[PDB]
Symmetry: C3
Subunit: 334 residues, 3 copies
């Protein structure tokens, strides 16, 4: 193959590079020197390991295309990624649209995706709400309120607000109760086709541990709820829910075509399913997500339509190969 | 193949029709027109899609046998299903025995299956109980009581019962505490053989979301616990528990032979495992259940005995093929 | 093959014997007569079934090597296992080091594994602690304390301690809050190589059921929290956590070489992942664990490096075969 497939050594690089190997590509992992054994010894999936954060020159010399790891932006920064000379699989423009609260909200609104209602004024609260003090640090100080009077009492106790003037830039959001559900999609630019690749339930600490603690013992302590990502658990959905989940993906993709020059490759809608069978989305991740790591040997969904194991990583590699084969590599790269 | 395999477009039709294709059958999905893309585009498993609830005439013309979807009865009604001219995989008689509370209880009692003890008179309560007001609407108003005195105090508060005369037709049931466990079986009439196909943990809203909510925050709200089915999570059992789980299935099948003209094909016992390693069953589903949808590529149990991926859907198709091959199709149909 | 592979009929014998068959070995299951159908009919993986707890003479005549089942020691006793004339896969010396609290603590300390801090004197408590009354019977009477004053008040109420003299031999341990995570390793003596085989989340009753109970209903009852093993749920870790998890395994193995004549074959570190991404280990199981039973058809980790399904059971069988092939069987047996 002409191009080599390269990725940052974290998040889902094992899955991506394995998928790349399975499709006949030579592979490059780049990142921290202490995780080199992971990709070259314990799981030999990288033909080359470069011990640098972003070795632009070596990658250009190796004819690499970079497959954006889920934490690629977080380790390198949005500005550095946007100015990459090394070709990037997917649309670099989506990065600002998925990480900026307001752009993201507009994307989802245009895609007709059910999201939590935002309250600008505390006196407008008619249903239970979650309030998030700025600057939000992974659920730090988050509390619930049921009505305006309840809000102001808690604003006094937890924030020291005694006059309404003094309420300083916060977030008030409809509290949506449901089970976490993370659908994994892939949009093929080559085939102009959306797929559902897999679904997972993200596994988080300490939030998924507290359910093991008796109510009595929880109440004796002032506990700090946290949402650190630890791992991923495979799930399937109830079958009659798939169509709206897939249509949600179509609309997200369609809206991106009009807003940002398009969306292709892997993405995920992160939300909850309510008791009324509503899919409410908290975030879009316009990138591969760690939940896809379960499905190195395919998913209950890919085995519905392929005769072989297809991970999201392999699907990316298939897309790149197919683009080369049809002389349209440049169309899937930015 | 002579017959085509047909199913209602919901619940587990993807799995069933894929399994049918893998065994050399042509496939028919019938149902709502808006889910047609699911079975013909996103997961191309249906050769024919009929946009009708029950197109009896088209199905007879296509030489279809219907594989009962798990929600086939709920969408069509028991009377319509019972009077089908189109051949039905399995025993149509089991439908009343699994949905009527009293017939179901008799089935399980005859099969020697541990079930929750039912209390007819509130004054007989010696261990903690769950009380279910009629007509039961998915856990609406369900509460706990520990003794007769506790029951009557709560009967006053939550139901307005001030005289024992006024207690109007309710359900009082031993409260059984355990982890949800859903074994999936298949009984082959052709081979006169029971298999364990797979096991899952059904994923429900809002019940599986509340564990993520701190006790303190739960207490500020009067919350409504619900059990809407959202998806399914794969599990395996502790190995020493398999024998009693399998024997439970044998006894269920054996009792059906005496009570209703037999049970064959897929079924599931829905219950909990207590800390004392007791399997307590709340319901029998004498049909394929959605938990089997995880195992399109086989399960940790089928790979113990087959050299290829066997879903419950594929197993059904294998049964039908084997019946045709041995000239006994009529024995597995009603 | 010369040797046959034998195991006690429980815990993970299905997985082990299937793996043995897949690698060309004849198989022996021995144990209770009532579980014989499980290994010979429902999942035909045993060529021979001996209806005895430890039929030493028959096993020697059949040229068997025993693969230690996870509950092999619990059903037979450590002394009986230590004196086995039948060859045992792995190092029999590890058995005392993993089951004796003090030896285990030394092993983990030498391996540089983060464990919960132990408090000898209640007056040293500076962070929340869990206190375990002797003799510990699966979490019976376990309670929390936050400081010395809090401890003594609870020591009075729950244990009747009114004078500090009277405090009779108990356990006080740093309370570590995190999500349960069970990495499965395999160390090959033949290849002098550590692998990560799979990861699971053990499924326990009633602890994993209480999260489904509303805080309000939990408080009305004096509930007994239990940790009976029921099953296993597959997970994958966040990728950036794998290196420290694998290095933990290397250090455990390395420390065993110096302390007990080495560790080879399957083992597991049982612990939790905290919100700060710390892996805290409660126990080492220097044996195959039931969580590996999910991965009869491989795991998201084995499909990263093999072209075929590799369970821990199959991996054991591969090790034994490879030892025979390289004339070093005696090196992997004790
Ligand atoms: N409107 C809502 N209703 C119910 N639950 C919510 C809502 N918003 C967030 N949550 C839950 O609370 C958690 C906190 O996540 P949130 O997005 O607020 O911050 P974060 O992503 O953890 O950190 P940061 O915002 O700093 O990146 C979420 O993972 C989600 O499970
Ligand atoms: N005896 C019991 N002990 C403990 N938990 C129970 C018991 N019976 C039911 N439950 C739990 O409560 C939930 C309520 O289910 P239940 O069968 O009572 O109604 P449903 O099936 O949700 O709705 P419907 O009965 O209207 O079809 C069950 O899913 C089960 O988890
Ligand atoms: N230091 C700790 N911090 C937080 N949780 C703990 C701690 N120690 C144990 N636990 C939890 O409590 C449970 C009780 O297990 P523990 O090891 O104390 O006894 P056991 O193994 O269940 O029974 P036995 O000790 O009799 O074999 C563990 O499974 C673990 O989940
Ligand atoms: Na986002
Ligand atoms: Na039923
Ligand atoms: Na141990």
């Amino acid at each position: 193959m002409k191009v080599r497939i390269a990725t940052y050594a974290s998040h889902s690089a094992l899955q991506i590079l394995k998928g790349a190997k399975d499709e006949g590509f030579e592979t490059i992992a780049f990142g921290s020197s202490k995780v080199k054994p992971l990709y070259t010894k314990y799981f030999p999936v990288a033909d080359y390991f470069i011990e640098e954060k972003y070795p632009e020159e070596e990658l250009l010399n190796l004819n690499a295309v970079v497959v954006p790891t889920g934490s690629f932006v977080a380790h390198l920064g949005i500005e550095l990624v946007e100015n990459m000379k090394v070709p990037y699989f997917g649309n670099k423009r989506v990065l600002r649209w998925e990480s900026d609260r307001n752009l993201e909200r507009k994307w989802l609104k245009k895609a007709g995706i059910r999201v939590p209602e935002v309250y600008e004024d505390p006196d407008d609260i008619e249903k239970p709400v979650i309030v998030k003090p700025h600057g939000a640090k992974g659920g730090k100080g988050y509390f619930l309120a049921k009505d305006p009077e309840d809000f102001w009492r808690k604003a006094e106790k937890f924030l020291g607000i005694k006059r309404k003037e003094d309420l300083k830039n916060i977030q008030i959001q409809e509290y949506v109760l449901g089970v976490p559900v993370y659908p994994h999609y892939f949009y093929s630019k080559v085939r102009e086709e959306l797929e559902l690749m897999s679904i997972d339930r993200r596994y988080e600490s300490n939030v998924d541990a507290i359910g093991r603690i008796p109510a009595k013992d929880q109440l004796e302590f002032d506990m700090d709820i946290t949402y650190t990502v630890i791992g991923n658990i495979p799930i399937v959905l109830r079958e009659s829910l798939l169509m709206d989940v897939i249509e949600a993906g179509e609309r997200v993709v369609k809206a991106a075509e009009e807003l940002m020059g398009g969306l292709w490759g892997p993405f995920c809608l992160e939300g909850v399913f309510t008791p009324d069978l509503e899919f409410v989305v908290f975030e879009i991740s316009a990138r591969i997500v760690a939940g896809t790591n379960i499905f190195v040997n395919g998913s209950p969904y890919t085995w519905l339509r392929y005769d072989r194991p297809v991970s999201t990583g392999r699907r990316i590699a298939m897309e790149i190969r197919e683009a080369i084969e049809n002389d349209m590599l440049e169309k899937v790269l930015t």
